[PDB]
Amino acid sequence: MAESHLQSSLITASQFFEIWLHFDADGSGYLEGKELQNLIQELLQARKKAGLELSPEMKTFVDQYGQRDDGKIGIVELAHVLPTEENFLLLFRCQQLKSCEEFMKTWRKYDTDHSGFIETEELKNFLKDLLEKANKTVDDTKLAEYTDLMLKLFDSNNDGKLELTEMARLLPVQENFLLKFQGIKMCGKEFNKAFELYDQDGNGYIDENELDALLKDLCEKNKQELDINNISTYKKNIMALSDGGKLYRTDLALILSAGDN
16 A cells, blocks of 8 residues: 555545555554654655655655654645645645644634534535635645545544544644644543533633633643643634634634544
């Protein structure tokens, strides 16, 4: 399989994911630790095997990441090491067109009434908006291949819908909260409980201040991931799923749930 897809095609990011899953051991949804050197070694193998040199990004991926033992990557760093789909990647570059959080403000923009996760026809419309912004057109082999892998690799209940952490695995893991938040996971159950606790006004809604309270709670719960030097930063973050400074709990149900709702 690796032998094949690595040295073949214009790997879309579903098949990319297959190759990735071929060494995404932990299933972190991020190429974790030593499995990167495991990747990297199969990559450089596929390379020297099929007689393809390990191109300076892939070769540097071994030279700079072949020792990223305590490392972790999203689809982002590998998507241009394994040359996935460079033009399709432009929308993937929209997850990194500024930040890992402000694009999330974009992601809920299309959805219906902001359900917190885009549905099928709605994510099948998500790309259309993106198509109007990539300054290209994002061709059929970009739009569908890409819309589909988002909608699949992180379909949270196999409903044909889209929640964050695929687009957020395709998000730049820099100032994101999206990987810390996969391990931070309360549980969708205490998630529901805590949200009711964050709803201390009894409004049935939460605004970005109680969001920092969401995090004062969380940090003091999972300080190995959520740290007080960025806690009002995580407030900055989740704030971007919610609507108008005022968080409806529909869109802040995937950050801290677990990767579900």
